[PDB]
Amino acid sequence: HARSTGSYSLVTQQPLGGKAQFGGQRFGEMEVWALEAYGAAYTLQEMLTVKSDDVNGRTKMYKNIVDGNHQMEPGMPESFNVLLKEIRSLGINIELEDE
Amino acid sequence: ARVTVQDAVEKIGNRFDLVLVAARRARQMQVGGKDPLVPEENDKTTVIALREIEEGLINNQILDVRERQEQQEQEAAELQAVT
Amino acid sequence: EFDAIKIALASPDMIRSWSFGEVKKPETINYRTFKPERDGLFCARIFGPVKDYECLCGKYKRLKHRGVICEKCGVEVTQTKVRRERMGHIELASPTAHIWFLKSLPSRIGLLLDMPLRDIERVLYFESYVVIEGGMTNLERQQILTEEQYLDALEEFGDEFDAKMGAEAIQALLKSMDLEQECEQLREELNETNSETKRKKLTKRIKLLEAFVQSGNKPEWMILTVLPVLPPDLRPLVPLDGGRFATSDLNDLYRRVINRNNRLKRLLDLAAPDIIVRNEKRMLQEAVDALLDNGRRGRAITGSNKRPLKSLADMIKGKQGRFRQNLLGKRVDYSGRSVITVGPYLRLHQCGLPKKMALELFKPFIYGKLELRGLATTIKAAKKMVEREEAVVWDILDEVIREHPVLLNRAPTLHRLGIQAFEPVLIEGKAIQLHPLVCAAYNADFDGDQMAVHVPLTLEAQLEARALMMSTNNILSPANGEPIIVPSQDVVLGLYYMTRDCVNAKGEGMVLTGPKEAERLYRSGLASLHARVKVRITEYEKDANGELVAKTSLKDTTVGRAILWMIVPKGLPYSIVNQALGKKAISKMLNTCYRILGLKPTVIFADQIMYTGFAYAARSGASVGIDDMVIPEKKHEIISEAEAEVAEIQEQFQSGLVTAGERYNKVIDIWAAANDRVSKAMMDNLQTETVINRDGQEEKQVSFNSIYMMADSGARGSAAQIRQLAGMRGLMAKPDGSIIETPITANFREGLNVLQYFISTHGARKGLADTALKTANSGYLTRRLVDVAQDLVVTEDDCGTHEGIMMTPVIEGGDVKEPLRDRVLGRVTAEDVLKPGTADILVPRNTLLHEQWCDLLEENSVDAVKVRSVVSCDTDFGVCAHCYGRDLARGHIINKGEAIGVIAAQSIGEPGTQLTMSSIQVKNKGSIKLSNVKSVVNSSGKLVITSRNTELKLIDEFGRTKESYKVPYGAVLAKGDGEQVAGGETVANWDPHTMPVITEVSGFVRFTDMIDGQTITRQTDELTGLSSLVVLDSAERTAGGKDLRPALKIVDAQGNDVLIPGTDMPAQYFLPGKAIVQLEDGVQISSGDTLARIPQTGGLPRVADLFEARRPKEPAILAEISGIVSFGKETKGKRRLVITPVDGSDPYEEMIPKWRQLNVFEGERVERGDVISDGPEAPHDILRLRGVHAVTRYIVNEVQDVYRLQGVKINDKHIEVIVRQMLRKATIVNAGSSDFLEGEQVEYSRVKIANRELEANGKVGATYSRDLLGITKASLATESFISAASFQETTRVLTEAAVAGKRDELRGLKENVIVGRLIPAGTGYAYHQDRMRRR
DNA sequence: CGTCCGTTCGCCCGTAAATTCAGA
DNA sequence: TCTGAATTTACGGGCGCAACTATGCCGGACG
RNA sequence: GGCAUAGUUG
Ligand SMILES: [Mg+2]
Ligand SMILES: [Zn+2]
Ligand SMILES: [Zn+2]
């Protein structure tokens, strides 16, 4: 199986799972640890933001790759916004304070 | 082509600053405006940047010096283009 | 964009601020038309448009109306991403208690009102009353009532009085409470009390109240009045096949709450009776409590065929929440997966990637190149050209593959070598070709394994893959120093067969002019591969200033050894290939090549070794047959002897000479002996299987047997397996764990019958189940290790400290288990290493000990080197490079930035699956040295040790401590201190079953403070003829003389007491109970003779408990303070032991249970941290009594014992840094001039920086007290709450962070992963430093 | 067919609460 | 007869990763 | 396309 770009899930804008659905491989938690053990901070960042759930980031990355410029805009993962909304949906006010 | 980057690592003894410097040089050559400082042998920009690092004619300080010289040239040329 | 995350309680005003419209109707969709309802859960006026830039009724459908709001329905025509982020709210008719602050354990509301959880649960769910405004009546405030009590109070106190019910009562109590006055009253009660449990409860309540006042929270916000609703795109309805809908388990729990709320609202308008509205309010409370956390209260509601539905807490917590399922690990694009195959032709830096997988993975790059070369103006044409797979897209793919690495990863990524970057090679197939050498690093065989490929897109990712993750950069394992690309099984078999010799072959003894002639002779058939010949070898030695110096000689070797010498690079000596070259030999050959020549020659050499090993393993034709498993001719007679012996033992048992247990033991031992004899016979017959000669006398040689060669070379198998192949496979164990009397006397070349096979199935099923249930434990342990130590990063270059651990070789009691060379290899020294001769600095103070320094330390016989450790580093928030030392992946010092916490956790947890679930015999010739000893000679000339922890060391002639032993109190020494003796004869003798009462002075014996009848007990012996006087304990003697403790006095011939040598106190010994005294009254004694007789773990779980710091079930008690010791009250529950110092705090005392066997008497002066009882020592006590170096040494030794028992080589740096992360908190004891509390637990770095900056000023810093927490407790008590929430116990951590209003700076590695920015470890360390400098 | 509203039974450990000693 | 320590007891946390195939379903009951 | 169940692979 292999996948460049396909469908993405609804609650989290991450690629689907499996191969019957044209899904993507799960760079899991241990793979993230393995990249952290290296110095691969940019590989990991593009792994968990651009290639997974940064909608604007991934559209811009696809446009840049087609344009021949290999460079990513980091952005913020949509699943983190989902987690923020789900914690805020309890009686807990969680926010990202200003810089 | 490249097999090991040990020469580049020993020339820039951090193994992490090498990645950043090579990425900066490869982005200067890929967009890029600039041209390789080494005879290109059908290699991509990252490999060419690492091969330049091997020769010792590119590092962080050299890139910063060239960038500030280019900024000064841009400031001068715009200065005489308008006034 | 932001630099921190803030969490707090959500005020109802804030909740209304989030909302964009109140949800009133419990309807999602019309189920006939797919339009959203008016003001239901899935709405359009509240949450936004269903489709982009279109109104709901269709009046506005273009971008020209961007921002307007329709009037017919009222939908703000804009994007649908707002429908993904617009929140709503529900106006509850009655206040509802938030379940998270009610049932958090500890309950926040419960201990905010100091009210027991049962009573508040009763009042909340409408079965009891609580009083507000008690007034001048017979009722208190927190006093609970019931129906009868409330009726009595209303009929009696019908005046101004208010006993409420439900969450309204709790909200009234919370709002009518002053926090500052409660703080003051609780503080004065804490300062003016004497209880311990009262102090604990009061200080917890004070901590909660002060954390509440410090933050902006208000207690009444814990009771929900406005309930937020999640955006409808985060709880969507996915239409399935048919008119039905997929019932999400969040629109079902919002539906119930809205139903109950509307019912309550319509029942309050018509003034329903009290019981009905109470029941409705209780149902609403339960519905809200099920929405927030379903099943926490109990009776989890189910919606679809008895299945407990997922609530918000279930969606944010657990293994399938948002942290561990969608934030820490994600699904990625540009990824593939396929079955791996071998491809031996590959070079170490490249892997074979299928053409179709590459075409699908690199589709954007192919589109870019097609558009660049003008083959497709639009992207649709390029997509069509690629999906038709034209003849030109393959050239494009080949020229975009050129130097673009791909990350190959195998599924259980145990350590960082489980994902490596390779260069693709396009393969006409569907299976990945993985280089054979990297299989050991991946733990990947080819029986059906699958691996995943990821494509690094951006330039930084490609350069990280090439410079950090390349397979040619990962030569050495990060857990130790040994290489990780060692040739596995076929290469070692080929190199063993090639580098070998036989007594007579083709071309024996002919003289060869070089390796080239050797190859030309072997390939032409004129000489055997292993034939002893003289060749001319020109080897290059680089002992000069980096210059290769040639040296030519005539080496007597074999043809195959010369052929292999054609491969070895120039810098290695020829002795490296003059041996048989098993597996360890090849491993050390690669290690020496790396150490001498570097990286590139080592990679080329490994590739060449693999190629030539495969080639000559194929050339050997080394098969396996049925005749290669030679059965010994003596097996039958050995088994017959064993059966005769078991028959005679059965005869000896049936006659009554022996019991059942000893018969069982005898049978087990004789069967083990028979099995050992059979194994020895078969091993000999396979070792010298060949007896070959045709030119004279027969000569023994190492056998060319296939099985023996495969076992001896280290390729595959071992002694145990080859033993079961030919000899008997031996004893088997029952599932209960007990050994079976009758073993399996049949090998696998012979056929096992039914019973033997059944017993083997017992054994195999047990092992399979243990492996399955052990993988989970190892994974959990390594996850906890990662979580406790993931933010630890090398931040500085040299902390500039002179503290370190004194590394010495570890000795179990026999030979040295680990030498000093491998314990100080690649670690920066702490002090100056003085030469063993006389006070001469052998190596400088801060030099990294590489191989040269280690070997020159070895030749000078250095036994103790003080070295810098991670745990002893004074760097705030990180570890300096010099305290860590060698990277262990490269040969240089660790770089500034490299994340060592994750590396340490992975290195420790990776071998987790491998782990399972009287006299002193001096063996070497050397001196004898006693340490911590105060001995004295008796009349017989035998020394007796009067100390407690004396260490007996057998030293070699060079000064190195070779043997270590523990000498108990009262052991007989036939030799002296510091006098060299002969090794082979026992030097110390004693009796373990009898604790001696040996003397220190001489004279006569007087039993003082003794009365016959109650103080002692008489025993009139009948089988010996001598009487006995035994002193008993307080619980066994009579009630006559238990208040006075009898003593033993040594006097002169007149009766005057003999004084202790050194002090003015007469030598009296307080005799304890249960003492077997053979002597009578009035017996002459001397010095150094006994007075009486005083009678008397695991594998992976052991490591888990050591890292979790579990107190053992029988903790060995230690001494907090020095001085003399004595006893106190006669068993006030237990026995009190008082240690009185010389000049310190006299009133120190401890309560010891009297059932445990004490060790110290009343006549020993001890220091802090000395053993008083026996048993395992609790690590907390070691830390608090001996120091930090003692506890880190204890933990590293106790885990390395397990890892060495199971044959695992893990460096000590990883255990040291895990220990450092364990002891990260500290408790304040003296407030000092700082702003800390009295005894609050703060982080060590914060108190360290605070009192460091105070020391710069004229004040005095605060004294701290370090703590040892387990890995899970240390990883949950972290200043950053996001790491703790993503670890275990999300609910509790989030509740604590919300109540305390904690703020997270996200300065670790997990927080930046969750947020989605650069990790401050590798290439992102520069970015984080830049953002700190440019803050 | 169109609509429409209410199953106990594992292992281990830490921690807070209830209970029981053990006094003065 | 009150009150603090220690013991016991009830209860909530946790219990590996990645991958593939299939069926059933999302609710059983009045007009 | 989400969950559950069952089976399977390393
Ligand atoms: Mg396998
Ligand atoms: Zn409208
Ligand atoms: Zn340091």
PDB file of C-alpha atoms and ligand atoms in Angstrom, chain C residues 799 868 873 880 883, ligand 3:
ATOM      1  CA  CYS C 799      28.458  22.925  34.295  1.00  0.00           C
ATOM      2  CA  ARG C 868      31.293  12.969  36.358  1.00  0.00           C
ATOM      3  CA  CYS C 873      25.173  18.051  37.565  1.00  0.00           C
ATOM      4  CA  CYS C 880      25.767  19.691  30.546  1.00  0.00           C
ATOM      5  CA  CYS C 883      28.522  15.340  32.856  1.00  0.00           C
TER       6      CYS C 883
HETATM    7 ZN    ZN G   3      27.347  18.913  34.581  1.00  0.00          ZN
END
